[PDB]
């Protein structure tokens, strides 16, 4: 689990949204895994808006952070599971690391920012949805 709040919106997996998020519904993104609703209070995360390669991300099932190499956003085969059949998800980053289900939300961070958010793994990889190109998110 975990989420990212950037001024009055909330970014979460939308495998995770809640029956808030859905009633709040600003955007969703099947073939991405993102949702985003909005909030009241004010958020003060800040969005990476760059091309880096290396950051920091969560990892819930070992209570660590872990620094990786990740690769630019892209089509990936991401295997069936009961919230989607087997299809390229868009915007994926993949780099070597570990991630179990619970761990999706998990946020990925470089020096500029907030870069995404844990969305899938297996295979010793994690993989992220990037949330650098969502512009609007910043007003
Ligand atoms: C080979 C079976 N296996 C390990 C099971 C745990 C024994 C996995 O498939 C597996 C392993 C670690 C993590 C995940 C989560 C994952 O990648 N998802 C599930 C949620 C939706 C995601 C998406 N963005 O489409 C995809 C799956
Ligand atoms: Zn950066």
């Not at 949204?17 to 909005?38: C, G, I, P």
């Amino acid at each position: 689990s975990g989420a990212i709040y950037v001024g009055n919106y909330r970014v979460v997996n939308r495998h995770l949204a809640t029956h808030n998020d859905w009633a709040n519904l600003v955007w969703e993104d099947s073939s991405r895994d993102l949702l985003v609703s909005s909030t009241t209070a004010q958020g003060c995360d800040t969005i990476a808006r760059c091309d880096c390669q290396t950051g920091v991300y969560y990892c819930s099932s070992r209570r660590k952070h872990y620094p990786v190499s990740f690769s630019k956003p892209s089509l990936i085969f991401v295997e069936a599971s009961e919230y989607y059949p087997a299809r390229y998800q868009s915007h994926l980053m993949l780099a070597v690391g570990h991630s179990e289900p619970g761990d999706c939300g998990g946020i990925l961070r470089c020096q500029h920012g907030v870069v995404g958010i844990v969305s899938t793994g297996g295979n010793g990889l994690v993989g992220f949805a990037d949330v650098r190109d969502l512009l609007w998110l910043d007003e």
